[PDB]
């Protein structure tokens, strides 16, 4: 396996991802209305946890761009539970790529994991030709954002088994990043009223 060469086409997809969804924000403001993407980024992921995942998954490296899903990753930060939808809608009607799966997890008892994930084929020409790669699309709230960026990290340290303390500590935690994001929903078109004043 040579990873630098295998990977290069995610890299590429990562960096026209950032810009091509960068610009949606841009577009709604340019238009004076609110923008439904607060903002973007984007990671390729590292070799190890791809090796991980081939290694959980049973995906064999021949099968790599077509079997894993999650290679490039991308992640739309979004202002309001509300604005995840919208998001959606602008990313099911665009031709540059093609929506291949979704995965509501906003609705998932108000605690826990909170998120939204699209899988997205995306065509790259790279030099030698074009590629097709698949990249992972997470839509979230700044709180939602918060929460799964810690329990992400402490999952890893852990290997997904938690002391009791961490373990209600998250749940805990989890429940009051709901109540925060469910809280300013409320009052969303008023916030957003006096934002687009501008």
């Given at each position: 396996m040579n990873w630098e060469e295998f990977l290069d086409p995610y890299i590429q997809a990562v960096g026209?991802?950032?810009i091509?969804?960068?610009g949606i924000r841009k577009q709604f403001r340019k238009q004076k209305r609110h923008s439904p993407i607060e903002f973007v980024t984007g990671r390729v992921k590292p070799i190890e946890?791809?090796?991980?995942?081939?290694?959980?998954?049973?995906?064999?490296?021949?099968?790599?761009?077509?079997?894993?899903?999650?290679?490039?990753?991308?992640?739309?930060?979004?202002q309001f539970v509300d604005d995840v939808n919208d998001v959606l809608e602008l990313l099911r009607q665009r031709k540059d790529m093609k929506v291949i799966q979704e995965r509501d997890?906003?609705?998932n008892k108000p605690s826990g994991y909170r998120s939204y994930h699209v899988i997205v084929e995306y065509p790259v020409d790279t030099i030698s030709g074009q590629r097709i790669i698949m990249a992972e699309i997470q839509i979230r709230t700044l709180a939602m954002n918060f929460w799964a960026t810690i329990e992400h990290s402490l999952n890893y340290k852990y290997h997904g088994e938690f002391p009791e303390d961490i373990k209600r500590r998250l749940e805990l935690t989890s429940k009051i990043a709901?109540?925060?994001d469910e809280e300013m929903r409320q009052i969303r078109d008023d916030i957003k009223e006096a934002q687009l004043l501008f």
């Open positions: 026209e991802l950032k091509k969804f960068r946890s791809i090796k991980e995942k081939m290694v959980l998954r049973g995906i064999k490296k021949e099968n790599l761009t077509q079997d894993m899903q999650d290679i490039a990753g991308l992640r739309i930060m979004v997890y906003i609705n709901f109540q925060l």
